[PDB]
Amino acid sequence: MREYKLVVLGSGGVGKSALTVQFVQGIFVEKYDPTIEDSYRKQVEVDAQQCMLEILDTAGTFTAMRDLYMKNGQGFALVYSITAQSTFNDLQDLREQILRVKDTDDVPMILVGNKCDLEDERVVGKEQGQNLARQWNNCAFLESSAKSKINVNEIFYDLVRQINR
Amino acid sequence: MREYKLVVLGSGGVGKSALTVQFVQGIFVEKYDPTIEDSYRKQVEVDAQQCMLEILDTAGTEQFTAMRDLYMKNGQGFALVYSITAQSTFNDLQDLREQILRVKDTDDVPMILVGNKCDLEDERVVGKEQGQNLARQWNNCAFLESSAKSKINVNEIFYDLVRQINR
Amino acid sequence: APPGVLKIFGAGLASGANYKSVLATARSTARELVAEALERYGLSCVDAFALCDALGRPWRAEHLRVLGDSERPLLVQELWRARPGWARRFELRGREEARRLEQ
Amino acid sequence: APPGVLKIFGAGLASGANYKSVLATARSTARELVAEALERYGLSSCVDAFALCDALGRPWRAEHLRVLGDSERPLLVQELWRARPGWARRFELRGREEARRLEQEA
Numbered sequence: 421m422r423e424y425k426l427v428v429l430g431s432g433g434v435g436k437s438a439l440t441v442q443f444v445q446g447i448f449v450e451k452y453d454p455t456i457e458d459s460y461r462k463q464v465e466v467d468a469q470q471c472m473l474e475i476l477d478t479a480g481t482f483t484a485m486r487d488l489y490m491k492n493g494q495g496f497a498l499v500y501s502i503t504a505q506s507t508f509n510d511l512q513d514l515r516e517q518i519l520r521v522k523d524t525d526d527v528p529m530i531l532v533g534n535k536c537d538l539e540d541e542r543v544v545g546k547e548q549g550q551n552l553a554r555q556w557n558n559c560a561f562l563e564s565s566a567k568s569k570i571n572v573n574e575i576f577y578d579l580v581r582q583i584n585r
Numbered sequence: 586m587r588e589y590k591l592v593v594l595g596s597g598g599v600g601k602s603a604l605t606v607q608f609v610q611g612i613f614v615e616k617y618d619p620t621i622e623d624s625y626r627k628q629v630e631v632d633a634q635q636c637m638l639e640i641l642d643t644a645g646t647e648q649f650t651a652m653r654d655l656y657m658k659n660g661q662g663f664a665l666v667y668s669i670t671a672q673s674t675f676n677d678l679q680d681l682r683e684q685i686l687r688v689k690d691t692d693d694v695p696m697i698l699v700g701n702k703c704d705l706e707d708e709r710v711v712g713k714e715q716g717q718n719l720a721r722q723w724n725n726c727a728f729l730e731s732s733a734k735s736k737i738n739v740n741e742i743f744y745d746l747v748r749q750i751n752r
Numbered sequence: 753a754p755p756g757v758l759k760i761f762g763a764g765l766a767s768g769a770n771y772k773s774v775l776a777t778a779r780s781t782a783r784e785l786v787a788e789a790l791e792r793y794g795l796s797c798v799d800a801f802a803l804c805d806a807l808g809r810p811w812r813a814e815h816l817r818v819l820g821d822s823e824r825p826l827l828v829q830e831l832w833r834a835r836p837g838w839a840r841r842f843e844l845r846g847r848e849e850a851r852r853l854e855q
Numbered sequence: 856a857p858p859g860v861l862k863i864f865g866a867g868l869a870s871g872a873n874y875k876s877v878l879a880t881a882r883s884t885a886r887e888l889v890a891e892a893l894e895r896y897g898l899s900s901c902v903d904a905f906a907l908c909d910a911l912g913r914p915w916r917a918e919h920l921r922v923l924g925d926s927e928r929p930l931l932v933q934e935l936w937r938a939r940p941g942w943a944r945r946f947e948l949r950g951r952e953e954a955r956r957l958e959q960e961a
């Protein structure tokens with residue numbers, strides 16, 4: 421079995437932990453406990469292949485430990501809350517830091533817009549997410565909800581597919 | 586203040602701990618319990634200069650001690666100790682003498698030959714003429730007979746080693 | 753006295769979990785962290801669980817030591833290391849099974 | 856595994872004594888060794904007042920220590936762990952109260 425090391429990054433309260441836990445355990449985390457650093461191991465079939473995912477659930481609220489995430493991780497999910505405008509703005513500097521630390525403009529990645537089930541609460545429209553995805557060397561993009569299990573599997577699937585090239 | 590590494594070697598029961606505890610703590614030990622490996626530190630003056638001595642009170646139990654190899658390599662001065670009460674202790678010394686001379690690989694090692702329990706004149710098996718001749722044989726070696734009970738030559742054993750190490 | 757992060761491993765405690773991390777000061781205790789980790793794996797109950805210093809190599813812990821309640825685990829981590837060759841981790845285990853595996 | 860020897864340091868109990876060392880097996884407990892150490896230092900259950908300590912520091916006086924529990928097997932404690940780089944490590948025999956204090960504030 422081939423291991424893929426994946427990293428979930430983004431500002432506090434966006435749903436990195438909820439996305440990870442939904443993917444790995446199949447339950448929805450309601451409580452808000454800010455993560456320090458959780459790690460998960462899940463086996464998936466991704467295109468006729470048995471893959472072993474190590475997924476790093478990182479801290480929103482720890483710049484010291486951040487450099488090690490980026491040096492060792494092969495795939496990165498950058499996650500924002502469609503509810504929270506600021507969370508989107510903070511992603512720009514995350515992209516640039518991954519690229520700075522790895523020294524390549526060609527890193528497997530996916531821009532994740534979380535909380536799409538909170539439709540009556542949008543502050544970041546799908547257009548905004550695509551426009552940045554475009555600017556980011558035409559990077560991959562999804563809107564997701566960890567509550568209703570929408571594109572949750574996609575996030576980590578797409579990442580594996582990308583490393584596979 | 587120079588550090589002096591001193592090893593008290595010999596067969597069991599000869600009075601190794603006794604000599605050391607006397608020299609160091611000023612008291613004479615009662616009962617007899619097998620030493621694994623003990624270490625003492627005492628500051629004393631020799632010739633106008635105050636010195637630090639690490640004394641290693643070693644094991645009688647030769648079969649249970651392969652650590653012999655380390656402390657011969659490490660030690661700067663040796664006091665080979667036999668009781669004048671048991672002949673084995675004296676005979677089991679030429680072995681030890683050569684073992685030191687082999688490891689350091691020289692006959693010119695600071696050394697003092699020591700015949701302990703000289704207060705027990707009545708149970709003497711090893712003569713003084715025997716002890717002194719073995720010293721002449723051992724590349725004209727330093728020799729004393731000492732009593733840990735009577736304070737005979739106790740400090741003179743350790744001062745002599747220091748004096749021999751001064752080079 | 754620096755505040756580092758301790759990776760607390762869940763030796764069969766929350767499905768596909770591997771470790772949850774916990775911030776620890778030089779004044780933090782085992783018992784304070786067993787508390788912080790238990791509500792982190794989502795599991796007083798505190799009394800029946802133990803923070804463990806596990807050692808193995810190349811998994812299966814070859815030996816472990818259960819930490820005392822008073823012990824400061826940051827110092828246990830930062831001031832000691834495993835045998836060279838050997839790996840080391842902190843482990844949250846039920847008290848029963850932890851004491852059982854010390855012997 | 857091997858029936859090794861452990862130097863138990865007598866950081867001030869009897870003047871002169873640097874260390875006295877005991878035999879320890881893989882099954883030898885801390886309390887067993889406290890009992891043999893006190894006997895060898897010259898000191899019915901005066902054992903419970905004394906502690907076997909895993910001490911550490913730069914090379915000397917100890918910068919941090921840990922009091923072994925009575926159940927703990929000391930040969931394993933020294934064999935399976937090591938000090939961090941540049942640090943010395945020795946077993947110490949101490950009064951339990953002295954030890955529990957230093958275990959908390961150093």
Ligand SMILES: Nc1nc2c(ncn2[C@@H]2O[C@H](COP(=O)(O)OP(=O)(O)NP(=O)(O)O)[C@@H](O)[C@H]2O)c(=O)[nH]1
Nearest residue numbers: 433434435436437438450454455480535565566567
């Ligand atoms: N309705 C809804 N709520 C969500 C969704 N995703 C996450 N949440 C909620 O948002 C809150 C924060 O979620 P969490 O996963 O902890 O976000 P986080 O990015 O891991 N926070 P941190 O980085 O500080 O550890 C929780 O109450 C969680 O239930 C979603 O898709 N829909």
Ligand SMILES: Nc1nc2c(ncn2[C@@H]2O[C@H](COP(=O)(O)OP(=O)(O)NP(=O)(O)O)[C@@H](O)[C@H]2O)c(=O)[nH]1
Nearest residue numbers: 598599600601602603617619620645702732733734
């Ligand atoms: N009369 C007399 N008795 C002595 C003298 N030195 C030691 N003893 C006695 O002989 C016994 C053994 O002495 P000890 O110092 O234990 O010898 P050891 O060489 O250290 N034994 P081991 O090597 O097994 O630890 C003790 O009970 C001690 O009192 C001495 O000079 N005179």
Ligand SMILES: [Mg+2]
Nearest residue numbers: 436437454455
């Ligand atoms: Mg989180």
Ligand SMILES: [Mg+2]
Nearest residue numbers: 601602619620
């Ligand atoms: Mg002795």
